[PDB]
Symmetry: D2
Subunit: 115 residues, 4 copies
Protein backbone atom coordinates (compact mmCIF):
# COMPACT_ATOMS: atom_id res chain seq x y z
CA UNK A 1 0.00 0.00 0.00
CA UNK A 2 2.19 2.84 -1.29
CA UNK A 3 -0.41 5.60 -0.79
CA UNK A 4 -2.71 6.07 2.20
CA UNK A 5 -4.89 9.02 3.23
CA UNK A 6 -5.84 9.87 6.81
CA UNK A 7 -8.38 12.56 7.66
CA UNK A 8 -9.14 14.05 11.06
CA UNK A 9 -11.86 16.42 12.23
CA UNK A 10 -10.63 19.27 14.49
CA UNK A 11 -14.13 20.35 15.51
CA UNK A 12 -15.32 17.00 16.85
CA UNK A 13 -11.92 15.55 17.73
CA UNK A 14 -12.56 12.43 15.71
CA UNK A 15 -11.62 10.71 12.51
CA UNK A 16 -13.36 12.26 9.52
CA UNK A 17 -15.59 9.43 8.37
CA UNK A 18 -17.09 8.93 4.92
CA UNK A 19 -15.07 11.70 3.30
CA UNK A 20 -14.75 11.24 -0.47
CA UNK A 21 -11.20 11.36 -1.75
CA UNK A 22 -10.16 11.49 -5.40
CA UNK A 23 -6.63 10.99 -6.59
CA UNK A 24 -5.42 12.17 -9.98
CA UNK A 25 -2.14 11.77 -11.87
CA UNK A 26 -0.84 14.59 -14.08
CA UNK A 27 -0.79 13.52 -17.71
CA UNK A 28 1.78 14.57 -20.32
CA UNK A 29 -0.57 17.30 -21.60
CA UNK A 30 -0.91 18.77 -18.09
CA UNK A 31 -4.47 17.55 -17.46
CA UNK A 32 -5.47 15.64 -14.33
CA UNK A 33 -6.31 12.03 -15.10
CA UNK A 34 -8.42 10.10 -12.58
CA UNK A 35 -6.21 7.54 -10.79
CA UNK A 36 -7.99 6.21 -7.68
CA UNK A 37 -10.74 7.17 -5.27
CA UNK A 38 -12.65 6.06 -2.21
CA UNK A 39 -14.29 7.18 1.01
CA UNK A 40 -12.62 7.26 4.37
CA UNK A 41 -13.47 4.53 6.82
CA UNK A 42 -14.69 4.69 10.39
CA UNK A 43 -11.06 5.32 11.41
CA UNK A 44 -10.73 8.24 8.93
CA UNK A 45 -8.46 6.20 6.69
CA UNK A 46 -8.48 5.25 3.07
CA UNK A 47 -6.29 2.30 2.13
CA UNK A 48 -6.08 0.23 -1.03
CA UNK A 49 -6.02 3.15 -3.43
CA UNK A 50 -3.22 1.83 -5.60
CA UNK A 51 -0.47 -0.74 -5.93
CA UNK A 52 3.30 -0.53 -6.10
CA UNK A 53 3.19 -1.44 -9.80
CA UNK A 54 0.71 1.34 -10.72
CA UNK A 55 2.11 4.11 -8.50
CA UNK A 56 4.95 5.30 -10.69
CA UNK A 57 6.91 8.51 -10.34
CA UNK A 58 4.94 11.56 -11.35
CA UNK A 59 2.81 14.41 -10.02
CA UNK A 60 -0.35 13.42 -8.15
CA UNK A 61 -3.26 15.41 -6.74
CA UNK A 62 -5.29 14.16 -3.80
CA UNK A 63 -8.61 16.02 -3.57
CA UNK A 64 -10.47 15.65 -0.28
CA UNK A 65 -14.16 16.54 -0.52
CA UNK A 66 -14.34 18.65 2.62
CA UNK A 67 -17.35 20.78 1.58
CA UNK A 68 -19.70 17.79 1.45
CA UNK A 69 -18.28 16.48 4.74
CA UNK A 70 -19.07 19.71 6.61
CA UNK A 71 -22.46 20.11 5.01
CA UNK A 72 -23.44 16.54 6.04
CA UNK A 73 -22.67 17.59 9.63
CA UNK A 74 -24.81 20.70 9.25
CA UNK A 75 -21.81 23.04 9.25
CA UNK A 76 -21.05 25.82 6.75
CA UNK A 77 -17.51 25.57 5.39
CA UNK A 78 -15.10 27.79 3.44
CA UNK A 79 -13.29 25.53 0.98
CA UNK A 80 -14.66 23.63 -1.98
CA UNK A 81 -12.22 20.84 -1.21
CA UNK A 82 -8.73 20.35 0.18
CA UNK A 83 -6.07 19.64 -2.42
CA UNK A 84 -2.69 18.02 -1.87
CA UNK A 85 -0.38 18.07 -4.90
CA UNK A 86 3.02 16.38 -4.82
CA UNK A 87 5.61 14.42 -6.76
CA UNK A 88 6.09 10.73 -6.06
CA UNK A 89 9.86 10.02 -6.10
CA UNK A 90 11.52 6.58 -6.06
CA UNK A 91 14.66 7.95 -4.35
CA UNK A 92 12.47 8.54 -1.29
CA UNK A 93 11.03 6.03 1.17
CA UNK A 94 8.35 3.69 -0.21
CA UNK A 95 5.16 4.49 1.63
CA UNK A 96 3.30 7.83 1.42
CA UNK A 97 0.71 8.82 4.00
CA UNK A 98 -1.16 12.04 3.26
CA UNK A 99 -2.75 13.29 6.47
CA UNK A 100 -5.22 16.17 6.73
CA UNK A 101 -6.74 17.89 9.76
CA UNK A 102 -9.98 19.66 8.91
CA UNK A 103 -11.73 22.72 10.30
CA UNK A 104 -14.55 24.64 8.63
CA UNK A 105 -12.33 27.60 7.56
CA UNK A 106 -8.92 25.92 7.73
CA UNK A 107 -6.99 22.76 7.09
CA UNK A 108 -3.57 21.36 7.79
CA UNK A 109 -1.86 18.68 5.76
CA UNK A 110 1.38 16.78 6.15
CA UNK A 111 3.17 13.92 4.42
CA UNK A 112 4.57 10.99 6.37
CA UNK A 113 6.91 9.18 3.99
CA UNK A 114 8.41 5.98 5.38
CA UNK A 115 9.99 2.60 4.64
CA UNK B 1 -8.33 45.27 -0.98
CA UNK B 2 -10.68 42.32 -1.14
CA UNK B 3 -8.23 39.42 -1.61
CA UNK B 4 -5.01 39.27 0.39
CA UNK B 5 -2.55 36.45 0.92
CA UNK B 6 -0.23 36.14 3.95
CA UNK B 7 2.44 33.45 4.26
CA UNK B 8 4.64 32.44 7.22
CA UNK B 9 7.68 30.15 7.35
CA UNK B 10 7.50 27.65 10.22
CA UNK B 11 11.19 26.69 9.94
CA UNK B 12 12.63 30.20 10.24
CA UNK B 13 9.92 31.80 12.34
CA UNK B 14 9.50 34.61 9.84
CA UNK B 15 7.35 35.87 7.04
CA UNK B 16 7.73 33.80 3.88
CA UNK B 17 9.07 36.46 1.50
CA UNK B 18 9.10 36.24 -2.30
CA UNK B 19 6.45 33.51 -2.46
CA UNK B 20 4.75 33.46 -5.87
CA UNK B 21 0.98 33.24 -5.86
CA UNK B 22 -1.31 32.61 -8.85
CA UNK B 23 -5.07 33.06 -8.59
CA UNK B 24 -7.50 31.40 -11.00
CA UNK B 25 -11.27 31.66 -11.38
CA UNK B 26 -13.51 28.90 -12.73
CA UNK B 27 -15.00 30.03 -16.10
CA UNK B 28 -18.38 29.21 -17.63
CA UNK B 29 -16.86 26.26 -19.46
CA UNK B 30 -15.44 24.87 -16.18
CA UNK B 31 -11.73 25.51 -16.83
CA UNK B 32 -9.41 27.47 -14.52
CA UNK B 33 -8.91 30.91 -16.03
CA UNK B 34 -5.93 33.02 -14.86
CA UNK B 35 -7.23 35.82 -12.66
CA UNK B 36 -4.34 37.54 -10.86
CA UNK B 37 -0.83 36.85 -9.62
CA UNK B 38 1.87 38.36 -7.46
CA UNK B 39 4.49 37.61 -4.85
CA UNK B 40 4.72 38.13 -1.13
CA UNK B 41 6.63 41.10 0.22
CA UNK B 42 9.21 41.28 2.98
CA UNK B 43 6.27 41.13 5.42
CA UNK B 44 5.02 37.90 3.82
CA UNK B 45 1.96 39.71 2.48
CA UNK B 46 0.55 40.07 -0.97
CA UNK B 47 -1.78 43.00 -1.57
CA UNK B 48 -3.22 44.46 -4.77
CA UNK B 49 -4.17 41.25 -6.51
CA UNK B 50 -7.58 42.52 -7.57
CA UNK B 51 -10.26 45.18 -7.15
CA UNK B 52 -13.75 45.00 -5.71
CA UNK B 53 -15.18 45.53 -9.20
CA UNK B 54 -13.24 42.67 -10.81
CA UNK B 55 -13.54 40.26 -7.87
CA UNK B 56 -17.01 39.05 -8.75
CA UNK B 57 -18.77 35.95 -7.46
CA UNK B 58 -17.14 32.73 -8.53
CA UNK B 59 -15.01 29.79 -7.50
CA UNK B 60 -11.43 30.86 -7.02
CA UNK B 61 -8.22 28.90 -6.68
CA UNK B 62 -5.26 30.49 -4.93
CA UNK B 63 -2.09 28.60 -5.78
CA UNK B 64 0.81 29.33 -3.43
CA UNK B 65 4.04 28.22 -5.05
CA UNK B 66 5.62 26.54 -2.07
CA UNK B 67 7.98 24.35 -4.10
CA UNK B 68 9.43 27.31 -5.95
CA UNK B 69 9.75 29.08 -2.59
CA UNK B 70 11.61 26.21 -0.94
CA UNK B 71 13.76 25.52 -4.01
CA UNK B 72 15.07 29.12 -3.91
CA UNK B 73 16.22 28.28 -0.35
CA UNK B 74 17.93 25.11 -1.58
CA UNK B 75 15.63 22.72 0.36
CA UNK B 76 13.75 20.05 -1.72
CA UNK B 77 10.16 20.06 -0.30
CA UNK B 78 7.24 17.62 -0.61
CA UNK B 79 4.37 19.57 -2.16
CA UNK B 80 4.24 21.21 -5.53
CA UNK B 81 2.12 24.07 -4.24
CA UNK B 82 -0.63 24.75 -1.78
CA UNK B 83 -4.03 25.15 -3.40
CA UNK B 84 -6.85 27.02 -1.72
CA UNK B 85 -10.17 26.64 -3.54
CA UNK B 86 -13.30 28.51 -2.43
CA UNK B 87 -16.49 30.20 -3.54
CA UNK B 88 -16.27 33.94 -3.07
CA UNK B 89 -18.81 36.75 -2.81
CA UNK B 90 -21.88 34.54 -3.07
CA UNK B 91 -23.61 36.53 -0.26
CA UNK B 92 -22.29 39.85 -1.50
CA UNK B 93 -18.81 41.33 -1.42
CA UNK B 94 -16.48 40.19 1.32
CA UNK B 95 -12.81 40.72 2.10
CA UNK B 96 -10.75 37.54 2.16
CA UNK B 97 -7.38 36.92 3.72
CA UNK B 98 -5.82 33.57 2.80
CA UNK B 99 -3.14 32.73 5.31
CA UNK B 100 -0.65 29.87 5.05
CA UNK B 101 2.02 28.50 7.37
CA UNK B 102 4.72 26.54 5.52
CA UNK B 103 7.03 23.66 6.42
CA UNK B 104 8.94 21.49 3.94
CA UNK B 105 6.56 18.50 4.28
CA UNK B 106 3.47 20.22 5.65
CA UNK B 107 1.37 23.34 5.48
CA UNK B 108 -1.62 24.88 7.14
CA UNK B 109 -4.04 27.33 5.62
CA UNK B 110 -6.93 29.36 7.01
CA UNK B 111 -9.25 32.02 5.71
CA UNK B 112 -10.29 35.20 7.47
CA UNK B 113 -13.45 36.52 5.84
CA UNK B 114 -14.75 39.98 6.83
CA UNK B 115 -17.76 42.06 5.80
CA UNK B 116 -16.81 45.69 5.03
CA UNK C 1 6.04 46.40 21.15
CA UNK C 2 8.24 43.38 21.72
CA UNK C 3 5.64 40.71 22.57
CA UNK C 4 2.40 40.46 20.60
CA UNK C 5 -0.20 37.73 20.45
CA UNK C 6 -2.55 37.13 17.48
CA UNK C 7 -5.36 34.57 17.53
CA UNK C 8 -7.62 33.29 14.73
CA UNK C 9 -10.78 31.16 14.91
CA UNK C 10 -10.75 28.29 12.40
CA UNK C 11 -14.47 27.57 12.80
CA UNK C 12 -15.73 31.08 12.02
CA UNK C 13 -12.95 32.24 9.73
CA UNK C 14 -12.37 35.33 11.83
CA UNK C 15 -10.14 36.84 14.43
CA UNK C 16 -10.63 35.26 17.84
CA UNK C 17 -11.81 38.28 19.84
CA UNK C 18 -11.84 38.58 23.63
CA UNK C 19 -9.33 35.77 24.17
CA UNK C 20 -7.63 36.09 27.56
CA UNK C 21 -3.88 35.67 27.60
CA UNK C 22 -1.61 35.33 30.65
CA UNK C 23 2.17 35.54 30.35
CA UNK C 24 4.51 34.11 32.97
CA UNK C 25 8.29 34.20 33.33
CA UNK C 26 10.39 31.55 35.05
CA UNK C 27 11.95 33.05 38.23
CA UNK C 28 15.29 32.26 39.88
CA UNK C 29 13.62 29.67 42.09
CA UNK C 30 12.11 27.93 39.02
CA UNK C 31 8.44 28.85 39.57
CA UNK C 32 6.22 30.59 37.00
CA UNK C 33 5.91 34.23 38.02
CA UNK C 34 3.05 36.31 36.56
CA UNK C 35 4.48 38.72 34.01
CA UNK C 36 1.69 40.33 31.97
CA UNK C 37 -1.86 39.66 30.83
CA UNK C 38 -4.49 41.00 28.47
CA UNK C 39 -7.15 40.05 25.98
CA UNK C 40 -7.37 40.06 22.23
CA UNK C 41 -9.12 42.92 20.47
CA UNK C 42 -11.70 42.85 17.70
CA UNK C 43 -8.78 42.22 15.33
CA UNK C 44 -7.70 39.17 17.35
CA UNK C 45 -4.54 40.98 18.44
CA UNK C 46 -3.10 41.74 21.82
CA UNK C 47 -0.61 44.59 22.02
CA UNK C 48 0.91 46.40 24.99
CA UNK C 49 1.70 43.41 27.17
CA UNK C 50 5.18 44.62 28.05
CA UNK C 51 7.99 47.06 27.28
CA UNK C 52 11.46 46.50 25.89
CA UNK C 53 12.93 47.43 29.28
CA UNK C 54 10.84 44.92 31.25
CA UNK C 55 11.01 42.11 28.67
CA UNK C 56 14.41 40.85 29.73
CA UNK C 57 15.99 37.51 28.88
CA UNK C 58 14.20 34.57 30.38
CA UNK C 59 11.91 31.63 29.75
CA UNK C 60 8.39 32.81 29.12
CA UNK C 61 5.08 31.00 29.03
CA UNK C 62 2.20 32.49 27.07
CA UNK C 63 -1.06 30.90 28.16
CA UNK C 64 -3.92 31.46 25.72
CA UNK C 65 -7.20 30.76 27.47
CA UNK C 66 -8.88 28.78 24.74
CA UNK C 67 -11.35 27.01 27.04
CA UNK C 68 -12.63 30.27 28.46
CA UNK C 69 -12.87 31.58 24.89
CA UNK C 70 -14.88 28.61 23.64
CA UNK C 71 -17.06 28.46 26.77
CA UNK C 72 -18.17 32.08 26.18
CA UNK C 73 -19.38 30.82 22.76
CA UNK C 74 -21.25 27.94 24.40
CA UNK C 75 -19.09 25.20 22.82
CA UNK C 76 -17.34 22.74 25.25
CA UNK C 77 -13.77 22.36 23.86
CA UNK C 78 -10.98 19.84 24.51
CA UNK C 79 -8.00 21.82 25.78
CA UNK C 80 -7.77 23.90 28.90
CA UNK C 81 -5.51 26.44 27.23
CA UNK C 82 -2.73 26.62 24.72
CA UNK C 83 0.68 27.06 26.28
CA UNK C 84 3.59 28.53 24.37
CA UNK C 85 6.90 28.23 26.24
CA UNK C 86 10.12 29.76 24.90
CA UNK C 87 13.40 31.42 25.77
CA UNK C 88 13.38 35.06 24.79
CA UNK C 89 16.06 37.67 24.16
CA UNK C 90 19.01 35.36 24.74
CA UNK C 91 20.84 36.85 21.69
CA UNK C 92 19.70 40.37 22.46
CA UNK C 93 16.30 42.01 22.16
CA UNK C 94 13.90 40.64 19.59
CA UNK C 95 10.26 41.25 18.73
CA UNK C 96 8.04 38.20 19.11
CA UNK C 97 4.63 37.55 17.63
CA UNK C 98 2.90 34.45 19.00
CA UNK C 99 0.17 33.42 16.61
CA UNK C 100 -2.47 30.76 17.25
CA UNK C 101 -5.21 29.23 15.13
CA UNK C 102 -8.01 27.68 17.22
CA UNK C 103 -10.47 24.83 16.71
CA UNK C 104 -12.49 23.13 19.46
CA UNK C 105 -10.27 20.00 19.54
CA UNK C 106 -7.10 21.35 17.97
CA UNK C 107 -4.83 24.35 17.71
CA UNK C 108 -1.78 25.49 15.87
CA UNK C 109 0.78 27.98 17.04
CA UNK C 110 3.76 29.65 15.40
CA UNK C 111 6.23 32.34 16.34
CA UNK C 112 7.43 35.18 14.16
CA UNK C 113 10.67 36.55 15.61
CA UNK C 114 12.15 39.77 14.16
CA UNK C 115 15.27 41.80 14.90
CA UNK C 116 14.51 45.55 15.17
CA UNK D 1 -4.69 1.94 26.34
CA UNK D 2 -6.72 5.04 27.22
CA UNK D 3 -3.98 7.56 26.36
CA UNK D 4 -1.67 7.50 23.33
CA UNK D 5 0.66 10.15 21.93
CA UNK D 6 1.64 10.46 18.26
CA UNK D 7 4.32 12.87 17.07
CA UNK D 8 5.14 13.83 13.49
CA UNK D 9 7.98 15.87 12.02
CA UNK D 10 6.90 18.45 9.39
CA UNK D 11 10.45 19.19 8.24
CA UNK D 12 11.45 15.63 7.37
CA UNK D 13 7.98 14.26 6.69
CA UNK D 14 8.45 11.41 9.13
CA UNK D 15 7.44 10.20 12.52
CA UNK D 16 9.27 12.04 15.27
CA UNK D 17 11.35 9.29 16.82
CA UNK D 18 12.83 9.19 20.30
CA UNK D 19 10.97 12.25 21.52
CA UNK D 20 10.64 12.33 25.32
CA UNK D 21 7.10 12.81 26.56
CA UNK D 22 6.08 13.50 30.15
CA UNK D 23 2.54 13.35 31.39
CA UNK D 24 1.41 15.05 34.58
CA UNK D 25 -1.88 15.09 36.50
CA UNK D 26 -3.02 18.25 38.29
CA UNK D 27 -3.12 17.69 42.04
CA UNK D 28 -5.61 19.22 44.47
CA UNK D 29 -3.12 21.97 45.37
CA UNK D 30 -2.72 22.93 41.69
CA UNK D 31 0.77 21.44 41.25
CA UNK D 32 1.66 19.07 38.42
CA UNK D 33 2.31 15.56 39.67
CA UNK D 34 4.30 13.20 37.45
CA UNK D 35 1.95 10.54 36.02
CA UNK D 36 3.64 8.71 33.13
CA UNK D 37 6.44 9.18 30.62
CA UNK D 38 8.27 7.56 27.75
CA UNK D 39 9.95 8.14 24.41
CA UNK D 40 8.28 7.85 21.06
CA UNK D 41 8.98 4.77 19.01
CA UNK D 42 10.19 4.37 15.46
CA UNK D 43 6.59 5.05 14.35
CA UNK D 44 6.43 8.29 16.40
CA UNK D 45 4.06 6.70 18.90
CA UNK D 46 4.04 6.26 22.61
CA UNK D 47 1.70 3.58 23.94
CA UNK D 48 1.39 1.98 27.35
CA UNK D 49 1.50 5.20 29.33
CA UNK D 50 -1.36 4.34 31.64
CA UNK D 51 -4.24 1.99 32.32
CA UNK D 52 -7.99 2.42 32.44
CA UNK D 53 -7.91 2.03 36.23
CA UNK D 54 -5.29 4.76 36.77
CA UNK D 55 -6.55 7.28 34.19
CA UNK D 56 -9.31 8.91 36.19
CA UNK D 57 -11.10 12.14 35.39
CA UNK D 58 -8.96 15.19 35.99
CA UNK D 59 -6.70 17.71 34.28
CA UNK D 60 -3.59 16.31 32.58
CA UNK D 61 -0.59 17.93 30.92
CA UNK D 62 1.36 16.18 28.18
CA UNK D 63 4.77 17.81 27.72
CA UNK D 64 6.59 16.90 24.51
CA UNK D 65 10.33 17.62 24.64
CA UNK D 66 10.61 19.27 21.25
CA UNK D 67 13.73 21.35 21.99
CA UNK D 68 15.92 18.28 22.54
CA UNK D 69 14.43 16.62 19.45
CA UNK D 70 15.37 19.51 17.17
CA UNK D 71 18.79 19.95 18.71
CA UNK D 72 19.58 16.22 18.18
CA UNK D 73 18.85 16.81 14.48
CA UNK D 74 21.16 19.82 14.43
CA UNK D 75 18.28 22.30 14.11
CA UNK D 76 17.68 25.43 16.19
CA UNK D 77 14.13 25.56 17.56
CA UNK D 78 11.85 28.15 19.19
CA UNK D 79 9.93 26.35 21.92
CA UNK D 80 11.21 24.80 25.12
CA UNK D 81 8.62 22.06 24.73
CA UNK D 82 5.11 21.58 23.41
CA UNK D 83 2.42 21.37 26.07
CA UNK D 84 -1.03 19.87 25.74
CA UNK D 85 -3.33 20.46 28.73
CA UNK D 86 -6.81 18.95 28.86
CA UNK D 87 -9.50 17.42 31.05
CA UNK D 88 -10.18 13.70 30.85
CA UNK D 89 -13.98 13.21 30.97
CA UNK D 90 -15.82 9.89 31.40
CA UNK D 91 -18.89 11.17 29.51
CA UNK D 92 -16.69 11.22 26.40
CA UNK D 93 -15.39 8.33 24.31
CA UNK D 94 -12.83 6.06 26.01
CA UNK D 95 -9.61 6.43 24.09
CA UNK D 96 -7.57 9.66 23.85
CA UNK D 97 -4.95 10.15 21.17
CA UNK D 98 -2.91 13.33 21.47
CA UNK D 99 -1.26 14.05 18.12
CA UNK D 100 1.35 16.74 17.48
CA UNK D 101 2.95 17.93 14.25
CA UNK D 102 6.29 19.63 14.86
CA UNK D 103 8.19 22.38 13.07
CA UNK D 104 11.12 24.36 14.47
CA UNK D 105 9.06 27.54 15.12
CA UNK D 106 5.57 26.04 15.16
CA UNK D 107 3.48 23.10 16.23
CA UNK D 108 -0.01 21.81 15.72
CA UNK D 109 -1.85 19.52 18.08
CA UNK D 110 -5.19 17.76 17.94
CA UNK D 111 -7.13 15.27 20.04
CA UNK D 112 -8.69 12.18 18.51
CA UNK D 113 -11.12 10.84 21.10
CA UNK D 114 -12.79 7.56 20.16
CA UNK D 115 -14.54 4.41 21.35
O1 LIG E 1 1.35 8.32 10.36
C1 LIG E 1 1.50 7.12 10.67
O2 LIG E 1 2.58 6.48 10.59
C2 LIG E 1 0.28 6.37 11.22
O3 LIG E 1 -0.37 7.28 12.10
C3 LIG E 1 -1.61 6.75 12.63
O4 LIG E 1 -2.18 7.75 13.54
C4 LIG E 1 -2.22 9.11 13.34
C5 LIG E 1 -2.80 9.86 14.35
C6 LIG E 1 -2.85 11.24 14.29
C7 LIG E 1 -2.32 11.92 13.20
C8 LIG E 1 -2.38 13.31 13.18
C9 LIG E 1 -1.98 14.11 11.94
C10 LIG E 1 -2.03 15.51 11.91
C11 LIG E 1 -1.86 16.12 10.68
C12 LIG E 1 -1.83 17.50 10.57
O5 LIG E 1 -1.77 18.03 9.33
C13 LIG E 1 -1.85 18.29 11.72
C14 LIG E 1 -1.92 17.69 12.97
O6 LIG E 1 -1.94 18.46 14.10
C15 LIG E 1 -1.98 16.29 13.06
C16 LIG E 1 -1.75 11.17 12.16
C17 LIG E 1 -1.68 9.78 12.24
C18 LIG E 1 -2.53 6.42 11.48
O7 LIG E 1 -3.76 5.90 12.03
C19 LIG E 1 -1.86 5.39 10.57
O8 LIG E 1 -2.71 5.01 9.50
C20 LIG E 1 -0.59 6.03 10.04
O9 LIG E 1 -0.07 5.33 9.39
O1 LIG F 1 2.27 39.91 8.26
C1 LIG F 1 1.87 41.03 8.65
O2 LIG F 1 2.23 42.13 8.19
C2 LIG F 1 0.87 41.06 9.80
O3 LIG F 1 -0.15 40.06 9.64
C3 LIG F 1 -1.14 40.11 10.67
O4 LIG F 1 -2.10 39.09 10.39
C4 LIG F 1 -1.90 37.73 10.40
C5 LIG F 1 -3.03 37.04 10.06
C6 LIG F 1 -3.05 35.66 9.99
C7 LIG F 1 -1.93 34.92 10.25
C8 LIG F 1 -2.12 33.55 10.24
C9 LIG F 1 -1.25 32.60 11.05
C10 LIG F 1 -1.47 31.23 10.99
C11 LIG F 1 -0.90 30.46 11.97
C12 LIG F 1 -1.05 29.09 11.94
O5 LIG F 1 -0.57 28.40 13.00
C13 LIG F 1 -1.63 28.44 10.86
C14 LIG F 1 -2.10 29.19 9.80
O6 LIG F 1 -2.67 28.57 8.72
C15 LIG F 1 -1.99 30.59 9.86
C16 LIG F 1 -0.82 35.59 10.76
C17 LIG F 1 -0.77 36.99 10.77
C18 LIG F 1 -0.52 39.97 12.06
O7 LIG F 1 -1.54 40.06 13.08
C19 LIG F 1 0.55 41.02 12.22
O8 LIG F 1 1.23 40.79 13.42
C20 LIG F 1 1.58 40.88 11.12
O9 LIG F 1 2.35 41.63 11.23
Amino acid sequence: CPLMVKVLDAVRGSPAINVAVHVFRKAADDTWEPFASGKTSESGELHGLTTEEEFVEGIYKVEIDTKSYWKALGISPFHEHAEVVFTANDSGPRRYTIAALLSPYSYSTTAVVTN
